[PDB]
Amino acid sequence: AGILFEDIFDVKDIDPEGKKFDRVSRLHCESESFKMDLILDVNIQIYPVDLGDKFRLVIASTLYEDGTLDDGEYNPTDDRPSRADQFEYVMYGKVYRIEGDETSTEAATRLSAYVSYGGLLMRLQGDANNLHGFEVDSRVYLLMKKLA
């Protein structure tokens, strides 16, 4: 399995700075298992969300569960059993920044991963143990599925 990260998050705010964009919103989410905060740009026109929504999010290296990392080109017309069949909102991006936390002057253990899904910003911040496998200039798949 190429699952680099997987966690269930709950939304705490939809637009802290106002309705800037009509189609994209800046959701802030907190995890229950760990203290992993997520600031993610999402498309509400095609995938509507609410304030009290809770969703499972998985960041994977590849879209195929069998472990085949052959992602030279993606053909949407091809039909084959993939991980996206088990989720509802799949994005494709690249981890373009890994930044350490500057709030803690000493004994800091928190990092943050900045990923640009075609311009849509995603900051995943939390303990460095959960961010294992994240490297710069690495293209990944985000899979979000709303829960009951």
> Are 111 and 103 spatial neighbours (Cβ–Cβ below 8 Å)?
no
Q: Does 39 bind other proteins (CB under 8 A)?
A: yes
The reply on whether position 34 binds other proteins by CB under 8 A is no
Check residue 3 for interaction with other proteins (CB under 8 A): no
Could you tell me how many residues of this chain bind other proteins (CB under 8 A)?
A: 60
Nearer to other proteins, 33 or 86 (CB): 86
Measured from the CB atom, the residue of 9 and 87 that comes closer to other proteins is 87
Taking CB under 8 A as the binding criterion, the range among 6-14, 30-38, 52-60, 119-127 that sits at the site for other proteins is 119-127
Q: For the chain, where are the E strands, in sequence order?
A: 3-13, 24-31, 37-43, 54-60, 89-100, 110-117, 120-127, 138-146
The whole-angstrom separation of Cα 55 and Cα 9 is 6
Q: Which residue has the tokens 């959701």?
A: 27
Please list every residue from 49 through 88 that binds other proteins, using CB under 8 A.
Answer: 73-77, 84, 87-88
Copy the structure tokens of residue 89.
Answer: 């909102």
96 contributes a contact to other proteins by CB under 8 A: yes
Vertex 110, ends 104 and 114: CA angle to 5°?
115
Which of these, 50, 28, 49, 48, lies nearest to 39 by C-alpha position? 28
Among 1, 51, 136, 147, binds other proteins (CB under 8 A): 136
Q: Which residues bind other proteins (CB under 8 A)?
A: 16-18, 20-24, 26, 39, 41, 43, 45-48, 73-77, 84, 87-94, 96-100, 104-109, 111, 114, 116-121, 123, 128-129, 131-137, 143
